[PDB]
């Protein structure tokens, strides 16, 4: 068995190495459709539009986890916590 934390680093290098999309298509598409139901009913989505929302969403969450990691490391902890997330979103001015 590997010492805890090695597999996590190997995954860091692996996913930071490639361009692969990290969220599965169909669940994200159903989520987009559900969220869009509350605005205007019976809407049509092009595939490139859903792909666009997936690109922007995944990139936004990656940056959010970068800044959250900066907060957790500033706290002298290697484990990110919700207060780190909402702290980053509080400093960015998003809330």
């Amino acid at each position: 068995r590997y010492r805890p934390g090695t597999v996590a680093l190997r995954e860091i290098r692996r996913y930071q190495k490639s361009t692969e999309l990290l969220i599965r298509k169909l669940p994200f598409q159903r989520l987009v459709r559900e969220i869009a139901q509350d605005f205007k009913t019976d809407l049509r989505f092009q595939s490139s539009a859903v792909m666009a929302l997936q690109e922007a969403s995944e990139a936004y969450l990656v940056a959010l986890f970068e800044d959250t990691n900066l907060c957790a490391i500033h706290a002298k902890r290697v484990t990110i916590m919700p207060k780190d997330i909402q702290l980053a979103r509080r400093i960015r001015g998003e809330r």
Binding site: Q46, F65, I80
Partner: protein
């Protein structure tokens, strides 16, 4: 439902890309909330541009103009 369709391994991978080493157990609900927020913010704009053109289809250009509308510019899908 749906927002739960975003999976613990998914968010886990998104954190692995961001450089996060170890993750607390409560990150997942907060990440789903933030994702729902951002998606509402972009989709309301995209649907606005869609309704203005009097079209029933939400295209890629509408999403690009919504992202550029909110300050995050996207390339490769047109603009």
């Amino acid at each position: 439902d749906n927002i739960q369709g975003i999976t613990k391994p998914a968010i886990r991978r998104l954190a692995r890309r961001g450089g996060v080493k170890r993750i607390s157990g409560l990150i997942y609900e907060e990440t789903r909330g933030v994702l729902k927020v951002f998606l509402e913010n972009v989709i309301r704009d995209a649907v606005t541009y869609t309704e203005h053109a009097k079209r029933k289809t939400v295209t890629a250009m509408d999403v690009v103009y919504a992202l550029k509308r909110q300050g995050r510019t996207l390339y490769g899908f047109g603009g």
